[PDB]
């Protein structure tokens, strides 16, 4: 051993259908200007 336990974001922050959708929570990709 001596192998690294460092885990990058994708192989960790472990997964689910929902969580990847909800904390998609990111500022919306497109916006439309209104009056």
């Amino acid at each position: 051993l001596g192998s690294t336990n460092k885990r990058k974001r994708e192989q960790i922050s472990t997964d689910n259908e929902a969580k990847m959708q909800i904390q998609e929570e990111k500022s919306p990709k497109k916006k439309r200007k209104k009056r």
Binding site: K6, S27, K31, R32
Partner: protein, 422 residues
């Protein structure tokens, strides 16, 4: 009245061109369902693009860009019409020549194009948008900054594939200043951008460190709003994904007391990201594991390993298991972990967990056992105390039951521990 609006737009008269453009902007700016498809049917998009050329009056430019902004705000098919009409190099030109109004409209359009797909994101950057975009932040108009940061964030965004690092990394000094903003929306978006840029190899993390972003990130961890905490924590987490030196920068910035509070968050993602972050610090060297211990982060982790939702529980398992590997260098780490009651929740995890976690938990248990055997020779003793705890906690059987695992790595490991300590 689309055919007469269209006729007015094709007029050679400037005052009629402007009137028509305003009318188009209005129906594309309406409250309910804008007729983006119908407007495209009229074939007026190329004409609208003409109204953005450098010798057109500013107001015509402004109004045309607004209409094109909203057409680009719809589906990819509709954004494609704007892009294929060569609007983007004109949007970029306006970032130089335009009034603040025109600049803000043009950067909005560019945001919509960039946010459509990785190809369109990259296309905007290939058209050399970064230079005039960075320029916009010398302005002091809140709404321009706010909008531009959103566009800049869309440019940083995405992994499949990531954007040109040689280009997006130029925004880092701007972003470093931007996360000191008092405008919450600007804050949130800049943190998001930074969270994107910090997800990468050694050089990306170092670039984020070099503009002294980590200090401010750790401060923002205690922001009132989870809308700020979330992207800030994501960036902080990304950084300690780096080597021991880079991770030490975040520790020196006081991340550990900050994580203590985050472990209690009602927002599950924050709890989980906090556990993940800690795991990448306890994946560091012995002093960094020790620092996590000294920060009194182990009891909250052990409770989460015990009762949190599975995804969060998994991350807590990693943090504690990673910490246990520092046990070979100094046994007191294992002693402390065991006195904090980590053995039973680790063992109980062996059943419900997936193969990846099972291996991690077995490693942790074997570290606890290795130290326990060594603590027999070192002080003449007949029984491995940690092996007892594991047996008392029912982990012995659960480890034994792991021998019936399809995975050879898990089997060999579960077998080796059953025969060595039991």
């Amino acid at each position: 009245e689309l055919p007469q609006m269209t006729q007015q737009l094709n007029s050679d008269d400037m005052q009629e061109q402007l009137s028509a453009t305003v009318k188009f902007r209005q129906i594309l700016s309406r409250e309910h369902r804008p007729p983006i498809d119908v407007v495209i049917q009229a074939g007026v998009v190329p004409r609208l693009v003409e109204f953005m050329r450098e010798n057109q009056p500013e107001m015509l430019q402004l109004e045309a860009a607004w209409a094109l902004t909203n057409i680009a705000s719809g589906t990819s098919a509709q954004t494609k019409v704007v892009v294929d009409a060569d609007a983007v190099p004109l949007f970029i030109q306006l970032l130089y020549t335009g009034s603040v109004e025109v600049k803000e409209q043009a950067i909005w359009a560019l945001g919509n194009v960039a946010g459509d797909s990785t190809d369109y994101r990259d296309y905007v950057l290939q058209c050399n948008a970064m230079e005039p975009i960075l320029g916009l932040f010398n302005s002091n108009k809140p709404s321009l900054i706010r909008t531009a940061t959103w566009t800049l964030s869309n440019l940083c965004r995405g992994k499949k594939p990531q954007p040109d690092w040689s280009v997006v990394s130029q925004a880092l000094p701007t972003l470093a200043k931007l996360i000191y903003s008092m405008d919450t929306e600007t804050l949130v978006d800049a943190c998001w951008a930074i969270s994107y840029l910090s997800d990468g190899p050694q050089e990306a993390i170092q670039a984020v460190i070099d503009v002294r972003i980590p200090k401010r990130l750790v401060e923002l961890l205690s922001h009132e709003s989870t809308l700020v905490q979330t992207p800030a924590l994501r960036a902080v987490g990304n950084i300690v994904t780096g080597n021991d030196l880079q991770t030490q920068v975040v520790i020196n910035a006081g991340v550990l007391p900050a994580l203590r509070l985050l472990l209690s968050s009602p927002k599950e993602n924050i709890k989980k990201e906090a556990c993940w972050t800690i795991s990448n610090i306890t994946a560091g060297n012995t002093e960094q594991i020790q620092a996590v211990i000294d920060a009194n982060l182990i009891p909250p982790l052990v409770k989460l390993l015990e009762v949190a939702e599975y995804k969060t529980k998994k991350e807590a398992c990693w943090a504690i298991s990673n910490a246990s590997s520092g046990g070979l260098q100094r046994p007191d780490i294992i002693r402390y972990l065991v006195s904090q009651g980590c053995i039973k929740p680790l063992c109980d995890l062996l059943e419900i967990a997936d193969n990846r976690i099972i291996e991690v938990t077995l490693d942790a248990l074997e570290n606890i056992l290795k130290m326990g055997e060594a603590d027999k020779e070192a002080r003449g003793l007949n029984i491995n105390e940690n092996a007892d705890f594991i047996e008392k906690a029912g982990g012995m059987e659960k480890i034994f039951n792991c021998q019936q695992n399809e995975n050879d790595k898990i089997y060999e490991k579960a077998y080796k521990i059953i025969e060595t300590y039991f």
